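Support request, priority: normal
Reporter: lab tech (M.K.)
Component: structure prediction queue

Hi team, I submitted a job for lactoferrin from Homo sapiens yesterday, and the status page still shows it as pending. I've pasted the exact input below so you can check whether something in the sequence is tripping the parser. The sequence length should be 329 residues. Please let me know if I need to resubmit or if it's stuck on your end.
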Amino acid sequence: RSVQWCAVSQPEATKCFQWQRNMRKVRGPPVSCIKRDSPIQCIQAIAENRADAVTLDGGFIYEAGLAPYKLRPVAAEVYGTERQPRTHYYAVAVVKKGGSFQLNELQGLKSCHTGLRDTAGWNVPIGTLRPFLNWTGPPEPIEAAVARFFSASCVPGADKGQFPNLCRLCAGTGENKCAFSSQEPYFSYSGAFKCLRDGAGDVAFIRESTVFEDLSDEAERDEYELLCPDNTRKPVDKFKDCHLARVPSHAVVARSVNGKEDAIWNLLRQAQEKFGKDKSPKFQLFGSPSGQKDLLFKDSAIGFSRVPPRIDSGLYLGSGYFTAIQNLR
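Reply from support: The job had stalled in the queue. We restarted it manually and it finished. Here are the results:
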C-alpha cells in the first residue's frame, strides 16, 4: 500500500515529498503526502481515511482521541540522547522550603511561569488551579482570571497592555520586559526557577529537571521542595510522587480501527535507521531547513518509540495532563 502522511503546512509538504522520494532511493517502505491547513483538518482527514498518520502534541492528542475521531498514538517521538533517551517529563510547582501554604492556597501569592500558553509553565498549572479560579467560560480569557488570582506574576508573552499584572514580576529591560525571549531574564525554565530563586515570586511552574540542571549542590537544593496535588510538600527528588502532571512526548496518531499501525511503524523504524540523527547528509528525518523548524517531527527528536496497544489518548496523556486540558475547555 503505503502510509499517507499529513503535512499541516506547505514547508511541511516539501519535507514529506523529500521524505517519500528518499525512501524510494533507499528502497524502503513508500510514503505519500497530503497537504492540509491545520492539525485538526489533518485529524479529520486521517479520521475519514484520507490520510494515515500525523505527529501531534498533547493538546491535539487530546482532540484527536475524541469522538468522532477516536484516533490513538502508535509511535512516540523520543528526546534526549541515544545514551540517555527520554519520552517525557514532569510538570512541577517549585517553592522555597520553610513555608506552609499548599497548592490549594496559592491565591494572592506570586508566581513564576516559563511562558504564556507553554505546557509546563502554563497549561498544566493554570488548568490544575482551575477550581480556585473565579472564571466564567469564554469569551473572557483565562489570563483575566489568572491575573486576579495571583497578586503578581511573570508570564513572558503575556500582553503587558491588557494584563500588566502578569508581567509585574518580569525582569527584562524596557520594552524587553515580559518579552517572550532570552531578552527576558525570567524567561523559559531556568528564568522561571531563578524568578523563584530570587525571591521575586513564591512558586515556580517548571519541569522536575530544571532544579537538578541548575542546582548542582545537593545541599543547595535541599532549600527547595515540591507542591503536590494532595496538598502536601515534598523534596525535589520525589518528583515522581509529587507532580502536577506527567507530560509525554509528541506522538504519531493513527486510527484506532484499521489504522495501519504496523505499516506506519515499519515505515517509522526504517526511515529512522536510514535518515535518522546524523545518519544521512542526503536527507534528514529530524531536521528543518533554514528559517523553518519542527517540520513533521521535532528537530530535537532522535528516534521513535512504539506505543503499546489499547493505550488511548487519555491513557497516553495521564490524569494531571488530561484534566488540565479539559479544565481549560
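Residues 1-78+251-313 form a domain with the D-Maltodextrin-Binding Protein; domain 2 fold (CATH 3.40.190.10). The CA atoms of residues 261 and 285 lie 19 Å apart. Let us know if anything else looks off. Ticket resolved.
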